[PDB]
Structure 1
C-alpha cells in the first residue's frame, strides 16, 4: 500500500509516524535517529511532552548527515491548552520550532478543544482540583492557527481530540479560511471510532490514530485494564499472518485509511513497527478487529470533565 495520504492542503502525509509522548528526553534523540535510519519520515511531537529539544537534536543531526532532506520529513506538533489565547499562539509555535530546530512545521494541531488559563503550569488548578478554563473560544483559536499558515510557520493546521460537533463547529466557522487537515484521535480495537472517523473522512479531514497499541506505558494504567498486546484474539490474527501483535495493531488503522503513530524508544521495536507494508489483513480480519470495540479510552481526564468544551460527553 502507498506510504503517504493526500491532505486537503495539497501535501502528502506519511501514514506511519513515530510517537514521542513519554519518550524520555535522554532516550528520544537516539530513538528518532534510529527511526529515521530505518525509514520513518513522520514524527509526532508536542510542547507538553517536554522533549521537543531532544527530538530536534535528532532531526537536525539526520538533516546535517544528509540521511534525509527536510522536504522528505513530516513533522507534527501541537498547541497546548494554556496557549489558546490569540496573542499566545504564534509564540507557542515559535517555541516549538526553536526547540525542534525547524523553520516550519508540516502540521500543527490544536492539542485539545479545551483552553486553560495561561501561565507556567500546563494544568492550572483551582483550590479544589478543577482545571481553570480560558474564556477564549475555539473558533478564535482556529483563526489564530490560520494566521500561522499565512505567515509561513506551518504548512497545514489541524485539530486533536475534537468530537464531531466540535469538528462541525470549525467547519461552520463564519469566514473560515482553511479547513482542518487532520483530526488526531485515540483509536484502536477497543475504541474503534467508526462514527467520528466516517464523519471526518466524509469531510476530507484525515484521521490520525493515536495510542494504537493501547498505550501500555500510560502513567495511570491499572491491572484490571484490558490489554491489546496481550489479547489472545489479536495474537491469533498476528500468528496467522506471521507478524507480531503490534504489527497487526499498526496495520489495522492503515487499512481504514488512517495515519498511525505508534511510540517506542526501543530500537528493535522501532524497526519492527515499521515493517507493516509487506502484508494485508483480510476484510474478515478487519471486521473481526472492529468487533472488539468497547469504548475504552486511554486518554480521558477527570480534572477536565467540567470544562465546557470537554470532548467526551458527546456520543462522538
Structure 2
C-alpha cells in the first residue's frame, strides 16, 4: 500500500487525510496539530466549514515547530456554491488562502456543481425551501478555476459531487487548459460508487471518498437511517482483523485506489484512524463489503433537487 497516489498534474496526494466538516472552531486547531503529529499529511478543508482560520493556526504552529515542511503537506479546500460566478472565484480562493495562512493550495475543488445566488447566506432559499440558483454554468466556473492554476494560487483543481456527464462536460470543454485532478464523492459500503469510480479512474481522475464512516454526526440524521459503525456484519470483519469498525471502513476505500478523509476532533480517534497501514482486507472481505451497497446517500443536497445542475438524478 503506497501512502500516496499520483495525480494527473504530476503531484502526489496522500491517500489518508483528515476531514474537518463539523469540527468546531474551538477544537479543530488541536485536531489538526494532533493529526500532523500522528503522521497525517493531508487536510481536507472548505470555506463553508467556517473553521479555516483555526486550521490555518494549527498548520502554522507545526511549520514553526519544524514538525513538517510546507511541501510535505497536502492542503485541499473548496469553492462554495455562492461563488461560482467567474468574477468571484479568485477572491473566494484568496479568502481561503488568507484564512489558512497559505501561499497556495495543493488542490482546490468546485464543492458542488450547483451555483447559488451570491451573498452572505450559504444557502439562499426561496419561499418553497428550494435554493435560489445563480446564472452560472459548470464550464465558465471551470475556466475561472483554471486561472487560479495559471497564477500559481493552486497546484491542482478538481470537482466534488459531479456526476459522470458533468465530468465529461469539463473533459470535452473547448479550449480546456487543465483536466480535473480529483472528483471527491460520498463513498462507503452503503454507497459503493462502482460506476462513477470506474469512469473517473478510466479518465485518470483520482477519486476521494468522503463520509467514509457514514457521517454519524450529520445534523439531519434520522432514526430509520442505517448506521455503518453499528452494522454487525462490518463489526465481524473488524473483529477478524483485530481492528475497529472505523479502521475497516477507512481501509476499504484505500484498497480500491481511492483517497479517504475520515473526520474526527477526538485525539484518540485521530490516532486510531491513522493505524490502517498495518493490515489488509482480503479479496473476499472486499467483495463482501461491496455487496452491502444500498444506494444510500448521507449527502443528497435535497434543497437543490430542482436545480439545473443537480447531480444525483443521473444513475452515476
Map of 1:69 onto structure 2: 69
Q: Distance in 2 between matches of 1:309 and 1:274?
A: 36
Task: Provide the secondary structure at the position in 2 that maps to 1:58.
Answer: helix
Mean CA deviation greater in 296-305 or 41-50: 296-305
Residue 68 of structure 1: how far off its partner (Å): 0.2
Correspondences of 1:31-110 after superposition (within 5 Å): 31-110=31-110
Q: Aligned to 2:93, what secondary structure does the other structure show?
A: helix
1:313 aligns with 313
Per-residue CA deviations over 1:222-269 (Å, capped at 9, x if unaligned) read 111101001100010010000000000000000000000000000000
Q: Counterparts of 2:260 and 2:3 in 1: how far apart (Å)? A: 11
CA offset digits 1:87-108 (Å, max 9, x no partner): 0000000000000000000000
Q: Which runs of 5+ in 2 are unaligned?
A: none
Structure-2 separation of matches of 1:236 and 1:296: 22
Moved more, 121-130 or 153-162: 121-130
1:293 maps to which residue?
A: 293
- Distance in 2, matches of 1:53 and 1:95, equals 10
Q: Indicate the SS of the match to 1:310.
A: coil
Q: CA deviation at 1:125?
A: 1.3
CA distance in 1, matches of 2:303, 2:279: 42
1:137-188 Cα distance to aligned partner (Å, 9 max, x none)? 1100000000000001000000000001101111111111100000000000
Residues 125-134 or 213-222, more deviating: 125-134
The size of the alignment, in residue pairs, is 316
5 Å-filtered alignment, 1:236-275, equals: 236-275=236-275
3-state DSSP of counterpart to 2:199: helix
- The alpha carbon displacement at 1:129 in A equals 1.7
C-alpha separation between the residues in 1 aligned to 2:54 and 2:263? 15
TM-score (normalizing by structure 1): 0.99
| CA deviation profile, 1:55-110 (whole Å, cap 9, x unmatched) | 11000000011000000000000000000001000000000000000000000000
Q: CA deviation at 1:303?
A: 1.1
Residue in structure 1 matched with residue 155 of structure 2 by the alignment: 155
Residue aligned with 1:252, SS = helix
Find the aligned partners of 2:80 and 2:208 in 1 and give their Cα distance.
18
Cα drift, residue 302 of structure 1: 2.1
Q: Which is further off, 96-105 or 118-127? A: 118-127
Displacement of 1:128 in angstroms is: 2.3
User: What are the Cα deviations for residues 268-293 of structure 1, in whole angstroms up to 9, with x where unaligned?
Assistant: 00000000001001111000000000
Please, which runs of 5 or more residues in structure 1 have no aligned partner?
Answer: none
Q: Distance in 1 between matches of 2:285 and 2:159?
A: 30
Distance, in Å, in 2 between the alignment partners of 1:280 and 1:128 is 49
Which segments of structure 1 move beyond 6 Å, counting only runs of 4 or more? none
TM-superposition CA deviations, 1:174-227 (whole Å, max 9, x none) = 111100000000000000000000000000000000000000000011111101
Q: Hey, what does 2:196 align to over in structure 1? A: 196
SS at structure 2 position matched to 1:292: coil
- Secondary structure (helix, strand or coil) at the match of 1:197 reads helix
* Aligned pairs (5 A) from 1:109-120: 109-120=109-120
**Displacement after TM superposition at 1:127 (Å):** 2.4
Displacement of 1:126 after TM fit? Answer: 1.7
